[PDB]
Design a protein around this motif. Sequence first.
Motif, short mmCIF file in Angstrom:
data_model
loop_
_atom_site.label_atom_id
_atom_site.label_comp_id
_atom_site.label_asym_id
_atom_site.label_seq_id
_atom_site.Cartn_x
_atom_site.Cartn_y
_atom_site.Cartn_z
N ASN A 95 -15.96 12.28 68.97
CA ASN A 95 -15.72 12.52 70.39
C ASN A 95 -15.40 13.97 70.67
O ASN A 95 -15.58 14.36 71.77
N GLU A 96 -14.94 14.77 69.68
CA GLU A 96 -14.61 16.21 69.85
C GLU A 96 -15.60 17.24 69.18
O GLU A 96 -15.53 18.46 69.46
N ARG A 97 -16.43 16.78 68.26
CA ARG A 97 -17.23 17.69 67.43
C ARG A 97 -18.40 18.31 68.21
O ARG A 97 -19.19 17.61 68.83
N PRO A 98 -18.50 19.64 68.22
CA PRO A 98 -19.69 20.18 68.92
C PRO A 98 -20.99 19.83 68.22
O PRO A 98 -21.03 19.48 67.02
N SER A 99 -22.06 19.86 68.96
CA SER A 99 -23.39 19.66 68.41
C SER A 99 -24.16 20.99 68.31
O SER A 99 -25.21 21.01 67.66
N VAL A 100 -23.71 22.07 68.96
CA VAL A 100 -24.39 23.32 68.82
C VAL A 100 -23.35 24.39 68.52
O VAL A 100 -22.28 24.42 69.12
N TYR A 101 -23.70 25.22 67.56
CA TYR A 101 -22.92 26.33 66.98
C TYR A 101 -23.71 27.63 66.87
O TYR A 101 -24.95 27.60 66.74
N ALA A 102 -23.01 28.76 66.95
CA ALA A 102 -23.62 30.09 66.75
C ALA A 102 -22.77 30.89 65.79
O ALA A 102 -21.54 30.85 65.88
N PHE A 103 -23.42 31.54 64.82
CA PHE A 103 -22.80 32.59 64.01
C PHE A 103 -23.52 33.86 64.37
O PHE A 103 -24.66 33.82 64.67
N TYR A 104 -22.82 34.98 64.40
CA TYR A 104 -23.40 36.26 64.67
C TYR A 104 -22.88 37.26 63.64
O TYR A 104 -21.70 37.28 63.38
N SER A 105 -23.81 38.00 63.02
CA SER A 105 -23.51 39.13 62.21
C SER A 105 -23.95 40.45 62.87
O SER A 105 -25.07 40.57 63.34
N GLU A 106 -23.06 41.45 62.78
CA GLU A 106 -23.23 42.83 63.30
C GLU A 106 -24.12 43.61 62.37
O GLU A 106 -24.66 44.61 62.74
N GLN A 107 -24.24 43.12 61.16
CA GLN A 107 -25.16 43.63 60.20
C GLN A 107 -26.52 42.84 60.23
O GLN A 107 -26.52 41.60 60.41
N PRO A 108 -27.64 43.53 59.95
CA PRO A 108 -27.64 44.89 59.34
C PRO A 108 -27.75 46.05 60.32
O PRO A 108 -27.81 47.22 59.92
N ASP A 109 -27.76 45.75 61.62
CA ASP A 109 -27.80 46.73 62.64
C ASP A 109 -26.83 47.88 62.38
O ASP A 109 -27.23 49.06 62.51
N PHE A 110 -25.58 47.55 62.07
CA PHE A 110 -24.51 48.55 62.06
C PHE A 110 -24.83 49.60 60.99
O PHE A 110 -24.69 50.77 61.25
#
Length: 805
Positions: free
Chosen positions: A247-262
């Motif tokens: 009843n609480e668990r999301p179904s969509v997630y995002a991870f973001y890395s600043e690399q390798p741009d940085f």
Amino acid sequence: WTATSGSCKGRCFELQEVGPPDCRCDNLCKSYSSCCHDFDELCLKTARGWECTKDRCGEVRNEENACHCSEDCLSRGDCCTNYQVVCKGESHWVDDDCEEIKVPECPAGFVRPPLIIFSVDGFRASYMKKGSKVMPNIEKLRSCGTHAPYMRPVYPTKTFPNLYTLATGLYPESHGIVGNSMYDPVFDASFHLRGREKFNHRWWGGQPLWITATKQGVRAGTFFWSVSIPHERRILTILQWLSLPDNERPSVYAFYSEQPDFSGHKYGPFGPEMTNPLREIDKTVGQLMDGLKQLRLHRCVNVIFVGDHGMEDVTCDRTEFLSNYLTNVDDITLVPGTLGRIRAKSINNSKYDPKTIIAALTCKKPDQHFKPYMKQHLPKRLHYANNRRIEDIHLLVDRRWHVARKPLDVYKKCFFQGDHGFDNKVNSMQTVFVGYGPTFKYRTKVPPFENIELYNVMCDLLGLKPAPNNGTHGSLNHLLRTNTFRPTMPDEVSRPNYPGIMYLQSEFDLGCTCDDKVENKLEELNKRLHTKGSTKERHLLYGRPAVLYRTSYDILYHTDFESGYSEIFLMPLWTSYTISKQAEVSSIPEHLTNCVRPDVRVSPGFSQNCLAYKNDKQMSYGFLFPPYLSSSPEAKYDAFLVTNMVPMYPAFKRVWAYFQRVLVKKYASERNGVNVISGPIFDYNYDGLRDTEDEIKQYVEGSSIPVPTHYYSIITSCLDFTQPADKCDGPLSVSSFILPHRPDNDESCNSSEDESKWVEELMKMHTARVRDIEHLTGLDFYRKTSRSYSEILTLKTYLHTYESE
Ligand SMILES: *[C@@H]1O[C@H](CO)[C@@H](O[C@@H]2O[C@H](CO)[C@@H](O[C@@H]3O[C@H](CO[C@H]4O[C@H](CO)[C@@H](O)[C@H](O[C@H]5O[C@H](CO)[C@@H](O)[C@H](O)[C@@H]5O[C@H]5O[C@H](CO)[C@@H](O)[C@H](O)[C@@H]5O)[C@@H]4O)[C@@H](O)[C@H](O[C@H]4O[C@H](CO)[C@@H](O)[C@H](O)[C@@H]4O[C@H]4O[C@H](CO)[C@@H](O)[C@H](O)[C@@H]4O)[C@@H]3O)[C@H](O)[C@H]2NC(C)=O)[C@H](O)[C@H]1NC(C)=O
Ligand SMILES: Cn1c(C(=O)N2CCC23COC3)cnc1COc1cc(Cl)c(C#N)cc1C(C)(C)C
Ligand SMILES: [Ca+2]
Ligand SMILES: [Ca+2]
Ligand SMILES: [K+]
Ligand code: NA
Ligand SMILES: [Zn+2]
């Protein structure tokens, strides 16, 4: 003001943002300065690192540790990602063989496979091959799942516009994030990377995936990660969320890395220092997959590994300075770098004239590394005009270069060896796509596609109805094992008339002459049948286009071509013809030079007239079916019908004549015949969409003949080029363009030379997708093929970029 003396105990990385002055324990609290006092102590634990070791196995849970190696960690979902590897003899995910995932293999209670979006800043497409030895987790995702050789970002090839495009399926001009930096004159506010204004919601239009999910009952994790949260903690937090109850668990997630741009900015896309940031990203992917594997979710979750843009070599010394061009340089504001946007430094300065700026920036140095445009004259494929945040004057910068206002800006701020932001067809700006999971195909390579298409697919993966967007829903069905979206062709709105011979020659008073008084029943029946549609199967290979709006038009048949003639616009909406590999070019005879003939199927009242062109000293005329490619001398008279004529500036006629006389035949030799559909486009308000009659700003002098802003052509042949275009069994191959209809050739710096040195380069710059032409004309092409509709949708989104591989 935040009253930061409440607590974060058992609220760490809460999904429900609470309103200040209650203290927040969610992701944006750092970015607002509103975290509860104990956020860092409770939610950013780092003690003992991120990995179990043999000595930690079976330890007594100690809640100060960053992650756990105790016996109860799995059911709590807070083990270090390598726990079963270190403590239970299990293998790393990367060391397991690839096994097809035919169905979601999910724990009980999962109503749908979760989606995880793993976005990586500045991950250039070629890193997948060039860095493969140092990215084994990523290579496994790529080779086992579905991947494209590259993914096309949107313009500008910056971070916010692209991530926000990924989220919404919208071009920047429609979602509103048209740059990393912006001025909105309606709000009189500025948006910057640095600072707080970017957080205000009036910047961010359309409907992003997380809102689309929420509105349809699907919960989402955070998309924005504070820079102070380490990557390992983002991963653990996602894994924790995935362990929540149903009843609480999301179904969509995002991870973001600043690399390798940085790093890429500091060292260039392929600097030797880039190897480590690629290793680190790969390790992070492995952490996630080992983490998923411990939770038994590694054949349940769909994972998308995606970038926002690539990275090109750019240094300080490759800067163009507006101060070398303009005497008035202090009267303008420049948004600088890998693109340029110019507005007046002050709107009380009525001396400021954009046309004189443009003129001072045009073809002044022989190798000038930018080109100025009024925004409506930019290549229509960029879709970068219809937003008040985009300044009228734009500079498209050559790859590898920067533009700045004055030299002081570039040495009072060399620091960098990489940048991005350039034209989205530039190879160095291309990025990545891999999809891995039950819903994606297994060991499948798909062709390159545009990131605007992914929102639809993410919606498909989650069972959501997408908000209206610029994706073409269905055009990515070939990425997916199931949950494909099966659209129907739009319904034709106007049916054509098919007029026969209704007018006598002497009813036309056009100012038009043709020296055609040149007089048998073998070829009288022959020509009647050509006019009733006997060669139509030859020249209309994929059915007639459907007109998707209310109008009045006629289908006109001819030996060499077929047209849909608009009685409202007084010209063809489309003209369709096939040129075989063996077709010959002939010149226009002299008895026909300024010949225009009345079309006896179409009233004088719905025809153009030559007198308007004679009077209009700026405007001349051309033809949609080129007379140079007529099949016979008797057929060549059809090309001079008044219904085949369109207004063309003499400067554009050079372009058009070259395309028609030389390039079409070249393409037919190279492609084993081509079918061509050509016509006019009217986009006076630069919205990328077909204008109505009342939007037209320019007519041929003294007439109701409207002037197109552009001319299109769609050039179709057989993907297997050993089959001729008119006898193709299989998949099709297409290239198209949308040529700006301009009264000069200022855009082409080499235009005083012969057309073989400049016209083709202009055409490549204005390459287009069929789908762009559809929006612009309200036509639907490829109605009658033997191909599946999704395959056709994919063809309609194809862009021929004219880059090497
Ligand atoms: C890419 O896909 C997108 C999405 O499908 C396409 O964009 C759509 O195009 C539609 C056609 O242009 C457009 O429809 C209009 O919507 C108006 C209502 O808009 C508001 O509500 C919607 C719905 O939730 C919302 O999406 C809008 O958001 C826009 O506006 C704010 C800023 O103001 C932004 O934050 C947001 O980013 C977005 O901006 C973009 O759109 C606007 C235009 O809407 C642009 O100006 C921006 O630059 C930017 O590109 C809004 O909050 C609605 O009022 C329109 O209706 C007029 O026209 C019809 C004609 O039949 C008439 O019946 C109506 O009465 C009305 O006319 C009256 O107003 C006229 C103008 O003031 C006036 O002259 C007349 O006299 C009349 O009195 C219209 O239906 C839809 O909004 C957008 N959606 C988005 C998100 O952009 C896009 O076309 C695709 N691109 C390509 C190339 O295919
Ligand atoms: C970019 N970013 C930043 C960022 O830049 N930070 C933190 C400090 C600064 C530097 O300047 C401010 C933080 N977290 C993200 C990821 O954002 C996203 C990711 C994805 Cl995968 C998607 C999608 N789909 C959408 C987004 C947006 C929310 C941008 C729209
Ligand atoms: Ca970026
Ligand atoms: Ca328009
Ligand atoms: K003229
Ligand atoms: Na020129
Ligand atoms: Zn960057």
